Ligand binder design. Structure first.
Ligand code: NA
Ligand SMILES: [V+3]
Length: 129
């Protein structure tokens, strides 16, 4: 599913991400835009052989099992394919674990390089949430 910006903002707010660990909703929307273009089906292979999955590009090196990332962890205790659903529940619940681990949203390279320190409130402008 390719979300609209405000449709994703509303889904993320309903699933508890607005100000989760102090990250405003606009941070999460911005991260999803630059990680996946708001596409729940997005997949991208990493240089180490891991893959990133779904709307928040969650990495098989630590967070999920994709059957092809040797010596990796499954800290969200899910198959990576669960992260590709039109329902963002599994991606949100796993992202709450990630952002809580000590590194905050710096885990998301696109957030660090494209969202951090910008006016992220712009991402939710005009949305009936
Ligand atoms: Na894994
Ligand atoms: V890696």
């Amino acid at each position: 599913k390719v979300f609209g910006r405000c449709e994703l903002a509303a889904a993320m707010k309903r699933h508890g991400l607005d100000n989760y660990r102090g990250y405003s909703l606009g941070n999460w929307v911005c991260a999803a835009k630059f990680e996946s273009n708001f596409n729940t089906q997005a997949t991208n292979r990493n240089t180490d052989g891991s893959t990133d999955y779904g709307i928040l590009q969650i990495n098989s090196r630590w967070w999920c099992n994709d059957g092809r990332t040797p010596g990796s962890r499954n800290l969200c205790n899910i198959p990576c394919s669960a992260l590709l659903s039109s329902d963002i529940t599994a991606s949100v619940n796993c992202a709450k674990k990630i952002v809580s681990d000590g590194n905050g949203m710096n885990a998301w390279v696109a957030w660090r390089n494209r969202c951090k320190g910008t006016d992220v409130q712009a991402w939710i402008r005009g949305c009936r949430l």
